[PDB]
């Protein structure tokens, strides 16, 4: 049950993160990319990783050359990694330690892709049978309902799915989907209904047919708020056409374990598909929550997906620190962080489908490294998670890319592409100019374009500042073969042990978030008053003449 | 033609941005909100204002008080806002001058919703008979199109519109359709391609036959490289179909001034909509841009757009600055930015169909303020641009709001919520709900939570730490009546004012992008490279070794 102190308390405690402070002061802020590029012809492969997928067998390479690291850059921060106990933690996760430390809590989704059935045990029981059980059951699901074994209530094939559910209950499922659009069932409408704004049930239910639409509702406990309420939503249109309740059965399954409210609602016991308490929302879609991926894509490309973040485990698990890729990442995003004072952390695809893969690192990034508490309870003495963001490109490109080349921020960025589309529109043109973004953007980041290249060009002398790039902005390029389902789980176990790597240094709990109570306690406080005649003033002065100024808006006493 | 040299060098350089370092370090930076509001019933009051909008006869409330605001702090920004000359620089764009010092031209796109036809003119010559010309040709071609006058080349109504171009030419058109959705017509579906990735295009052709889909080629020179790539495949797709290139003109509209190139395009030159060289794309979704917008929801709507920004252009150039909304809002930014250091800027609206707002506003602010030159052509000593993110709540709070209420980063943030639905489910259950999570969300960031609280609520004394809410989390929120198409007209126009102040007091030009050259002329040369055998080395390192790799993944020569 209890276990061991912590290894160490504040990050900058650490002898090496005070070598890094030393090695920063005096050669790490002086280095400037084109400078050491013209002086090391090896700099690329120096600072470049492959990863095989052995699932689709392609590589993934990972090319961080154009970071603000030397040789002895990496030493030190490899050190830190060490000495921050980085695969201690890592190994304890794999075990299946309580590491969540906070909740007294395993963390264990590398246990649902855990494709090779290797021995996984929480609380010394055995995991891997439970896992495997859940994954059956979507195996079969999904089956039925592509199919069109399952009908709906008038015996219709079923061809709208409707996921309902907040977080990381939403935001994989969403991206997944998107990203692995090729791979998805032609005659099937996905709808993801998350926001507690009724206009996004609204418009869902709009466009479809109570006959042939099956809802998700993703809850563990089928008791969240902005859930049950949509879920409510959903039911009661549902019903205003299939009258019988027992109509539920054909048309609501529960992504959840709580038996008693799932049937309480008029789900059958049988179409609950349940995931742990070790299973982080915003570490969920490899479990139950990712039904949805499976429905539409089949659950042969979900099981691909699964296995290629367990490729990504595997590398994560077995690597030494020098070649391991998502520690690099993560002790990257320290070094800018916390020695050159980024308080942000661009991740741009250079793929369309991918769109909403930067809102879905956002979460696992901010929900778990947003911390300030060690693992000793102190207050940290460094900053923690970056404001992480993104658009894909080229439109981030034409969005914001000017502030990234010439605004007064450092800004460490990822660019992602796949070397083969999905799409080869025009006998592969849109592609080979995509790749000449994806290419062009990081070398013009790094080396700029001096004023002398400026007037040489021509331009006004008067002008040459203004069309100046000062260069020196760092980039991480990853380029994969293909987006395949395997392709992308790897792609996002990196993301995740990235994360991992960020926690581990600074010793927060990368696994909790008690950050989000407050405003669920007072929210529900203030749905009371709005629904009370005469209630409300009980806050601050803004919060109160808000309050009262939305009541007479919204004609409430 | 030429004019006064400017009225300052460097922000840093003026009396009052001297004076407000000084606040700063004695009292600035030690301000508690909750104690402020503990201290001053009348807080809310102070720092409040009321915007009437006399298009939809309502009004917008604009609450700063949760600001790090007192009267003083207050009068020292409006004292540095009157030392930069901010009145001035906002006369001289609204006189037509050429405030644009890098390119030489006029600012604009407050012309464009001169819904009032007051004089206004460029170098001497009225434009308001040119604006005017195109809104009346856009009206009628809208009305043909929704009408069903306006038929395909098989004599079927057109119900599909493909809109093709980048940046400011897809972002508004996007977020500005999205949000205002319910008033869109029901038969119509609108597909936006911006990406040169194939697979934008291909999704959006895959699901439109050519007998009934209309495409709008947004560029202004009708040359950009990647519009003009999709635009010719959105043709070769038709031809397929159509065969006859006659049948090009009923299927095809340039918004655009290049009648050659539009014309040699196939486009009938009596379909082009023209917007001016003083139309920024990203201040252009008011001029021909719109024309998606007009399309969806018809013209008179469309002028009722124009028109909401119009009262807020009027606000913004009549009002004194201490009353002065988006003045104030763009003094706040250049605070927090340049004396607390925040590097970013939350915008999250509180309402679904605004789900695309936060990146339209990140172009908005980051290509114009991403800046470091001033006018006199220094470089700035201070930080500007601040990286603009968002994502609609509440599905925003279930992703990042723990780091919002738990990180170390301060991070300005607006909060913007109608206070009636446009679909008020459930007996406006829905709407109560999310209203109490945007009144929460500011008071919950304000007032945090003590630990003396958290141990009152029966926490382990060893997680007390991980449960207190520092609190004295900034915010400012926006209460508008209801999102009809001239409430989102003032509130874009309050954050285009808003970026208009931040960069009158950094002295920088928010209306060029020269940032966005370089990344053109290499991708431009790599591209060359990509299709030329053999070709590909002159890089350095990291660029050489990518391209080399993406040439072996991808098979060329
Ligand atoms: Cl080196
Ligand atoms: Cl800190
Ligand atoms: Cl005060
Ligand atoms: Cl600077
Ligand atoms: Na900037
Ligand atoms: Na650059
Ligand atoms: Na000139
Ligand atoms: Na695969
Ligand atoms: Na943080
Ligand atoms: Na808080
Ligand atoms: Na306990
Ligand atoms: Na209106």
Same mark, same amino acid.
């Given at each position: 049950? %209890?276990?061991?102190?912590?290894?160490?308390?504040?990050?900058?405690?650490?002898?090496?993160?005070?070598?890094?402070?030393?090695?920063?002061?005096?050669? !790490?802020?002086?280095?400037? /990319?084109?400078?050491?590029?013209?002086?090391?012809?090896?700099?690329?492969?120096?600072?470049? $990783?492959?990863?095989?997928?052995?699932?689709?067998?392609?590589?993934?390479?990972?090319?961080?050359?154009?970071?603000?690291?030397?040789?002895?850059?990496?030493?030190?921060?490899?050190?830190?990694?060490?000495?921050?106990?980085?695969?201690?933690?890592?190994?304890?996760?794999?075990?299946?330690?309580?590491?969540?430390?906070?909740?007294?809590?395993?963390?264990?989704?590398?246990?649902?892709?855990?494709?090779?059935?290797?021995?996984?045990?929480?609380?010394?029981?055995?995991?891997?049978?439970?896992?495997?059980?859940?994954?059956?059951?979507?195996?079969?699901?999904?089956?039925?309902?592509?199919?069109?074994?399952?009908?709906?209530?008038?015996?219709?094939?079923?061809?709208?799915?409707?996921?309902?559910?907040?977080?990381?209950?939403?935001?994989?499922?969403?991206?997944?989907? +998107?990203?692995?659009?090729?791979?998805?069932?032609?005659?099937?409408?996905?709808?993801?209904?998350?926001?507690?704004?009724?206009? =996004?049930?609204?418009?869902?239910?709009?466009?479809?047919?109570?006959?042939?639409?099956?809802?998700?509702?993703?809850?563990?406990?089928?008791?969240?708020?902005?859930?049950?309420?949509?879920?409510?939503?959903?039911?009661? @249109?549902?019903?205003?056409?299939?009258?019988?309740?027992?109509?539920?059965?054909?048309?609501?399954?529960? %992504?959840?374990?709580? +038996?008693?409210?799932?049937?309480?609602?008029?789900?059958?016991?049988?179409?609950?598909?349940?995931?742990?308490? @070790?299973?982080?929302?915003?570490?969920?879609? @490899?479990?139950?929550?990712?039904?949805?991926?499976? /429905?539409?894509?089949?659950?042969?490309?979900? =099981?691909?997906?699964?296995?290629?973040?367990?490729?990504?485990?595997?590398?994560? $698990?077995?690597?030494?620190?020098?070649?391991?890729?998502?520690?690099? !990442?993560?002790? %990257?995003?320290?070094?800018?962080?916390?020695?050159?004072?980024?308080?942000? =952390?661009?991740?741009?695809?250079?793929?369309?489908?991918?769109? $909403?893969?930067?809102?879905?690192?956002?979460?696992?990034?901010?929900?778990?490294?947003?911390?300030?508490?060690? $693992?000793?309870?102190?207050?940290?003495?460094?900053?923690?998670?970056?404001?992480?963001?993104?658009?894909?490109?080229?439109?981030?490109?034409?969005?914001?890319?000017?502030?990234?080349?010439?605004?007064?921020?450092?800004?460490?960025?990822?660019?992602?592409?796949?070397?083969?589309? #999905?799409?080869?529109?025009?006998?592969?043109?849109?592609?080979?100019?995509?790749?000449?973004?994806?290419?062009?953007?990081?070398?013009?980041?790094?080396?700029?374009?001096?004023?002398?290249?400026?007037?040489? +060009?021509?331009?006004?002398?008067?002008?040459?500042? #203004?069309?100046?790039?000062?260069?020196?902005?760092?980039?991480?390029?990853?380029?994969?073969?293909?987006?395949?389902?395997?392709?992308?789980?790897? /792609?996002?176990?990196?993301?995740? =042990?990235?994360?991992?790597?960020?926690?581990?240094?600074?010793?927060?709990?990368?696994?909790?978030? @008690?950050?989000?109570?407050?405003?669920?306690? /007072?929210?529900?406080?203030?749905?009371? +008053?709005?629904?009370?005649? !005469?209630?409300? !003033?009980?806050?601050?002065?803004?919060?109160?003449?808000?309050?009262?100024?939305?009541?007479?808006?919204?004609?409430?006493?």
């Amino acid at each position: 049950p %209890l276990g061991s102190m912590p290894g160490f308390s504040q990050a900058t405690e650490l002898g090496a993160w005070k070598e890094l402070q030393e090695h920063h002061n005096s050669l !790490g802020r002086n280095i400037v /990319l084109k400078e050491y590029f013209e002086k090391d012809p090896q700099r690329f492969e120096k600072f470049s $990783r492959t990863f095989a997928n052995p699932v689709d067998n392609t590589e993934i390479l990972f090319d961080f050359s154009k970071n603000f690291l030397t040789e002895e850059t990496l030493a030190l921060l490899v050190k830190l990694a060490r000495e921050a106990g980085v695969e201690e933690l890592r190994d304890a996760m794999f075990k299946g330690d309580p590491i969540n430390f906070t909740e007294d809590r395993a963390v264990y989704h590398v246990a649902l892709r855990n494709v090779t059935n290797e021995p996984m045990q929480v609380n010394g029981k055995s995991v891997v049978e439970d896992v495997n059980s859940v994954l059956e059951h979507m195996k079969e699901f999904t089956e039925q309902v592509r199919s069109g074994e399952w009908k709906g209530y008038t015996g219709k094939k079923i061809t709208t799915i409707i996921n309902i559910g907040i977080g990381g209950s939403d935001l994989g499922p969403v991206m997944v989907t +998107e990203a692995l659009k090729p791979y998805g069932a032609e005659d099937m409408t996905l709808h993801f209904v998350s926001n507690i704004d009724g206009s =996004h049930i609204a418009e869902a239910l709009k466009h479809s047919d109570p006959e042939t639409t099956l809802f998700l509702i993703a809850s563990k406990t089928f008791t969240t708020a902005e859930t049950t309420t949509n879920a409510n939503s959903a039911k009661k @249109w549902f019903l205003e056409s299939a009258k019988d309740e027992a109509h539920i059965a054909k048309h609501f399954v529960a %992504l959840s374990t709580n +038996e008693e409210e799932v049937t309480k609602f008029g789900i059958d016991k049988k179409n609950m598909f349940g995931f742990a308490s @070790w299973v982080g929302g915003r570490y969920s879609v @490899w479990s139950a929550i990712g039904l949805s991926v499976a /429905l539409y894509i089949g659950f042969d490309n979900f =099981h691909q997906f699964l296995a290629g973040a367990h490729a990504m485990d595997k590398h994560f $698990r077995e690597t030494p620190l020098e070649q391991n890729i998502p520690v690099l !990442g993560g002790l %990257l995003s320290v070094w800018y962080s916390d020695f050159f004072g980024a308080q942000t =952390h661009l991740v741009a695809p250079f793929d369309q489908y991918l769109h $909403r893969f930067p809102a879905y690192l956002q979460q696992l990034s901010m929900e778990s490294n947003g911390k300030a508490i060690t $693992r000793t309870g102190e207050y940290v003495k460094y900053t923690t998670g970056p404001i992480l963001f993104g658009e894909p490109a080229t439109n981030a490109q034409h969005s914001f890319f000017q502030l990234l080349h010439q605004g007064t921020k450092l800004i460490p960025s990822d660019f992602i592409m796949a070397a083969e589309s #999905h799409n080869p529109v025009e006998g592969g043109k849109h592609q080979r100019m995509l790749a000449s973004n994806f290419l062009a953007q990081s070398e013009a980041l790094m080396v700029g374009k001096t004023p002398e290249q400026v007037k040489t +060009e021509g331009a006004p002398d008067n002008l040459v500042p #203004h069309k100046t790039f000062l260069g020196n902005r760092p980039t991480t390029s990853i380029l994969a073969q293909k987006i395949t389902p395997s392709t992308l789980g790897a /792609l996002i176990a990196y993301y995740e =042990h990235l994360t991992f790597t960020e926690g581990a240094v600074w010793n927060i709990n990368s696994f909790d978030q @008690w950050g989000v109570e407050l405003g669920k306690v /007072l929210a529900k406080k203030i749905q009371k +008053e709005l629904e009370t005649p !005469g209630a409300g !003033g009980d806050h601050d002065a803004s919060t109160s003449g808000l309050l009262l100024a939305f009541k007479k808006k919204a004609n409430l006493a």
